[PDB]
Design a protein around this ligand. Structure first.
Ligand code: 95B
Ligand code: FE
Length: 281
C-alpha cells in the first residue's frame, strides 16, 4: 500500500508535517540533541552559544550555529531551510517565527505527566528517524534505573532547590524537576508546593530550615547561565546548617548541565536518575 511520505505530528503548540527521515535537522532542545546523539541521527544545526558540557562535540563547526537558546539566528535558519526544527519551553514564544522557516515540533516535557510525555517524545523521534528499536531498548533500560531508585525512596523526604544570584527557589510535584517525586517516588518535604514557573517558587532560608528535609537536591543555575558556580556558597549558611540534610551529608548537587540546560532526552534522563541514585544510595 502506498502511504503518505510525511508524518502529521500533533504537539502542544499545534500540528507539524515532517518528512519521514528528514535531512536537515535543527535542534533547540538539548534533551532532543542528546537523544539524536544516542541514536546516531545526523544533526544540521543548534544554538552553540551555550552548549552543555556533555554535548560539547556539538560545538564543532561541523554544525551550523543558529544562535542561543532564547535568541535564534533567523537569517541562518532561513539559509538552511530545515526539514524539522525541535523546540521546547525557552522557544515557545518564537513558535510562529520558527514555523515560517521550517516544520517546527514542540517537544518539551509535560511535567504533569512526566513519564508519559517523555516516552511519547522519544517514541516520536524513533518513528521519525527509523530508530524505534533503539528508543524502546533505551526506554527499557531507563525503566530499570527507575525501578532501582523507587525501592529506596522510603522514609526520606526531599526538597528540590535551585540557586541563582544568591537566592533560592523551590520545586515540587508536577514541576520542572517534579520527576524526583513523581517518577522516582521520593516523598516531598512539602507535598502541597505547586510550582509551574520555569525558575521555581521563591522561598526563604527560614522555609527550607522549617521544612527540614532529609535530602536537599540543589541545582546550581549560575554555573550554566553565568559560568560561575554559586550553589555551595549560597546554601552553606547557618539556617540551612540546622537541617537533617546538611547535618547528615545529604545535600546532593545535581549537575546543571543535565538538569537545567538540558533534560528530557535518553541520555539526560538516564544521567539525571544516576545522579539521584548516587545521592540516595
Ligand atoms: O522562558 C524561559 N525564560 C525566559 C526568561 C529568561 C530570563 C533570563 N534567563 C537567562 O538569561 C537564561 C539563559 C540561559 C538559559 C536559561 O534557562 C536562562 O533562564 C535571565 O536570567 O535574565 C524559560 C523557559 C523554560 C526553561 C527556562 O529555564 C527558561 O528560562
Ligand atoms: Fe531559564
Amino acid at each position: 500500500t502506498e502511504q503518505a511520505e510525511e508524518m502529521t505530528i500533533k504537539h502542544q503548540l499545534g500540528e507539524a508535517k515532517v518528512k519521514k527521515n528528514p535531512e536537515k535537522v535543527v535542534v533547540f532542545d538539548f534533551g532532543v540533541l542528546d537523544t539524536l546523539d544516542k541514536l546516531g541521527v545526523k544533526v544540521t544545526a543548534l544554538p552553540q552559544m551555550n552548549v552543555p558540557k556533555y554535548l560539547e562535540k556539538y560545538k564543532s563547526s561541523d554544525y551550523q550555529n543558529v544562535g542561543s537558546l532564547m535568541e535564534p539566528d533567523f537569517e541562518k535558519l532561513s539559509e538552511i531551510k530545515p526539514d524539522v526544527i525541535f523546540i521546547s519551553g525557552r522557544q515557545a514564544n518564537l513558535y510562529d517565527k520558527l514555523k515560517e522557516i521550517g516544520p517546527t515540533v514542540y517537544i518539551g516535557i509535560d511535567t504533569q505527566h512526566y513519564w508519559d510525555s517523555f516516552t511519547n517524545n522519544m517514541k516520536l523521534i524513533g518513528q521519525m528517524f527509523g530508530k524505534e528499536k533503539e528508543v524502546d531498548e533505551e526506554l527499557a533500560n531507563i525503566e530499570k534505573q527507575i525501578e532501582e531508585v523507587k525501592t529506596k525512596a522510603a522514609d526520606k523526604k526531599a526538597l528540590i532547590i535551585l540557586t541563582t544570584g544568591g537566592k533560592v527557589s523551590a520545586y515540587g510535584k508536577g514541576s520542572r524537576f517534579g520527576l524526583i517525586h513523581d517518577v522516582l517516588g521520593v516523598p516531598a518535604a512539602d507535598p502541597n508546593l505547586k510550582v509551574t514557573n520555569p525558575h521555581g517558587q521563591s522561598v526563604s532560608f527560614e522555609y527550607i530550615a522549617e521544612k527540614n528535609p532529609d535530602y536537599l537536591f540543589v541545582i546550581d543555575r549560575d554555573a550554566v547561565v553565568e559560568g560561575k558556580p554559586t550553589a555551595k556558597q549560597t546554601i552553606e549558611n547557618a539556617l540551612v546548617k540546622k537541617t537533617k540534610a546538611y547535618q547528615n551529608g545529604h545535600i546532593v548537587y545535581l549537575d546543571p548541565n543535565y538538569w537545567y540546560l538540558s533534560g528530557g532526552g535518553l541520555t539526560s534522563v538516564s544521567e539525571m536518575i544516576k545522579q539521584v541514585e548516587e545521592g540516595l544510595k
